[PDB]
């Protein structure tokens, strides 16, 4: 215990030394973006109950959405059509994933199972391709690496990297104090970050499977996490109505985003294609945009009658989709 | 300006919307019931007699309800569109735990504005427990000897006044904790139930026939 504290005092002491300047002073000369206006262009209707997750497509035109009545729907974002409507076995689902190749779709929730569905079969139906079940908590995020590799973060303090043909766990990740909330993969595909209900964020390694770093600057549990486009930073949003920008090479907190008028928690955090706008969901029937450098408000995506539970920006950055508990998806330009 | 294929695409979309509307209707005539409870509570007998996620699909008088048990600070956000909750607590054995739990559930932010049904389970073994004398319930709450039921009790059986005071003190504790806050937002419905007794279904049927009626009256501006 004394040896661990020794290091604990010393690492902190070590880190203080690394810091030389803040972010506001350097980025003063960066002119503010200003006021930003986006208007609804589509309103996707057909979900009975509140929706929890959505995920765009690689072609930037199809999307998938998951609701609490046991419904996955694949939407054509141009003509508002409904390409597919799939029923789920468990009515409580918190996450959905759309494969980079466009052949598979993934879902999961309280059922303790992750389901992989095959889209481009030789018929007009969508059937179950794989049923991964090796967890004892509720899943909160699952992401595709390829058509074979999937990383799922669960409530049983474990993050698993699987293999789909067999159906057994391949690399298990442990080290979190509370249940895992959110997860995001790096563009370089080598690493990914995770956030759990212990106010701490943790990097990992895909191949070896070890916690390489750990970041802690929050007060309460972190609900959402996402990577920066560069791959050398990320951002978190937590229940204490705050967003944090964390760095990987510097291993230190960079900047915080919060205003005295916000009291509700943050549920989804996402980045623009370039990495200049930060879209943050909320529980006060809103969805805000922050200047990721100067830490200022830059407009409001008002228009929802309930809390915003899922956010997704398209790959080429020409649209943003927002879901809510009022069961209406809104597309903004 | 639609091609020969866009027309069929839109026809397929409309054929899907039909089915979606068919499902939305049936989704409005169903009432959902979250089932909380403690470890040793006799929920198993109740869910057997009405029949991770543990489900119940019982129906009564041409109306269908769906009961679900879970397994708490994290997944309570999901369960706020339910009609009501059938809370089960143990009675005929030592309670300070259970009261605590009731007091935390009754004040939850995502569980406000929802009425609570409250089964006091296993009374059958409370009749004997006080029949054996010794120290039944008074050692933990030194107020059973000092609490007296009024004349409005109207016991169903009246087999023993002692068990009547024993029942009514704990019922008063729960009712007090229910009415000590909430601004008339929701209401507790207590019952005395056992394991053996047949119908805790009608009771649930007659309940939540009052809650929706009350809501109805408040909307139509006459309450």
């Amino acid at each position, epitope marked *: 215990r004394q040896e661990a504290e020794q290091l604990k005092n010393q690492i902190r002491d070590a880190r203080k030394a690394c810091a030389d300047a803040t972010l506001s002073q350097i980025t003063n000369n960066i002119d503010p973006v200003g006021r930003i206006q986006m208007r609804t262009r589509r309103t996707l209707r057909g979900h009975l109950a509140k929706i929890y997750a959505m995920h765009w497509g690689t072609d930037s*035109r*199809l999307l998938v959405s998951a609701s609490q009545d046991g419904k996955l729907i694949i939407w*054509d974002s141009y003509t508002t*059509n409904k*390409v597919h409507a799939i029923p789920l076995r468990s009515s409580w689902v918190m996450t959905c994933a759309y494969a980079p190749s466009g052949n598979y779709v993934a879902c999961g929730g309280l059922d303790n199972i992750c389901s992989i569905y095959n889209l481009k079969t*030789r*018929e*007009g*139906n969508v059937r179950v391709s794989r049923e991964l079940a090796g967890h004892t908590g509720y899943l909160s995020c699952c992401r595709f690496l390829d058509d074979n590799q999937i990383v799922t973060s669960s409530g049983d303090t474990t993050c698993a990297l699987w293999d789909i043909e067999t159906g057994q766990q391949t690399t298990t990740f442990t080290g979190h104090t509370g249940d895992v909330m959110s997860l995001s993969l790096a563009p370089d595909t080598r690493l990914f970050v995770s956030g759990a209900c212990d106010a701490s964020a943790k990097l990992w390694d895909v191949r070896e499977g070890m916690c390489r770093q750990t970041f802690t600057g929050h007060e309460s549990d972190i609900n959402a996490i996402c990577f920066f486009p560069n791959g050398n930073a990320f951002a978190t949003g937590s229940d204490d109505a705050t967003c944090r920008l964390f760095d990987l090479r510097a291993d230190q907190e960079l900047m915080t985003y919060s205003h005295d008028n916000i009291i509700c928690g943050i549920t989804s955090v996402s980045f623009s294609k370039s990495g200049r706008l930060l879209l943050a969901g909320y529980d006060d029937f809103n969805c805000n945009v922050w200047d990721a450098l100067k830490a200022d408000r830059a407009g409001v995506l008002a228009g929802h009658d309930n809390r915003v539970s899922c956010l997704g920006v398209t790959d080429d950055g020409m649209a943003v989709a927002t879901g809510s508990w009022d069961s209406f998806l809104k597309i903004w330009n | *300006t639609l*091609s*020969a*294929e866009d*027309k*069929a*695409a839109v*026809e*397929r979309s409309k*054929m899907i919307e039909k089915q979606l509307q068919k499902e939305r209707l049936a989704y409005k005539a169903t009432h959902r019931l979250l089932l909380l409870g403690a470890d040793n509570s006799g929920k198993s007998t109740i869910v057997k007699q009405m029949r991770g996620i543990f489900e119940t699909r019982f129906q009564v008088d041409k109306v269908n309800f769906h009961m679900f048990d879970v397994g708490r600070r994290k997944w309570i956000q999901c369960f706020n569109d339910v009609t009501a909750i059938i809370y089960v607590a143990d009675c005929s054995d030592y309670l300070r735990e259970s009261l605590d739990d009731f007091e935390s559930i009754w004040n939850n932010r995502w569980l406000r504005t929802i009425s609570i049904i409250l089964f006091l389970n296993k009374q059958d073994m409370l009749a004997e427990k006080v029949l054996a004398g010794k120290s039944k319930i008074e050692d933990y709450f030194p107020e059973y000897a000092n609490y007296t039921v009024p004349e409005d009790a109207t016991p169903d059986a009246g087999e023993d006044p002692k068990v009547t005071r024993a029942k009514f003190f704990i019922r008063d504790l729960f009712l007090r904790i229910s009415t000590a806050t909430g601004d008339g937002k929701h209401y507790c419905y207590p019952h005395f139930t056992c394991a053996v007794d047949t119908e805790n279904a009608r009771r649930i049927f007659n309940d939540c026939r009052d809650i929706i009626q009350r809501m109805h009256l408040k909307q139509y501006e006459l309450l």
Partner: single-chain antibody
Amino acid sequence: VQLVESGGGLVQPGGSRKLSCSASGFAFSSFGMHWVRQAPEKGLEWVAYISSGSGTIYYADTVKGRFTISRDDPKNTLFLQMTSLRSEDTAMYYCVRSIYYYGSSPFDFWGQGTTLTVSASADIVMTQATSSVPVTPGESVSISCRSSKSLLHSNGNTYLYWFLQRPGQSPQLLIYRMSNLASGVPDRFSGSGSGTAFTLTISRLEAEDVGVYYCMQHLEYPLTFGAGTKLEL
């Protein structure tokens, strides 16, 4: 996936017939269906079309009011009734299936077909340039086709289909919308165009590339196949 036809034979003039195409191996109710006929020594022509849910029906201008088409999803089989058999009504028929959503592949499967013999208009025109081409293994083929009107739409879609019929088999889909490969076809084939002049290019030639090549359009619903082009080794 298997579509099998029933009916056909020798009939007297002026009679009536009923042909039934039965499907077993795929989800019938999500698919639209067509009938396509072929003359004893000529190309292919379109006869009818029924949608999914029976909410839209089309016929050919030739037989606009003499044939009827209907399906039984619970029985899982489609059929047509044929009346007032002319002298042109002698042919051999196939039932084709298709599906329409964003990115699908219509006309992706053909039936076996059955033969019917009888005893004793502003539509797009496709022109097949060369009616016969001599080829040898391991060289390139450059089949061409010409269209009366530009087939490209405002969005960008093209609606050109390439079919290849072997001697003794039904046609198979190779390219849909002028640029997309089919599922089970090799990467040897390629297709291109500029709205009116369409080209199918083969780089390496094998022994199974022998047959007749047909084109097709899907812009305006009365849809015409084309004469074809024969390849021999």
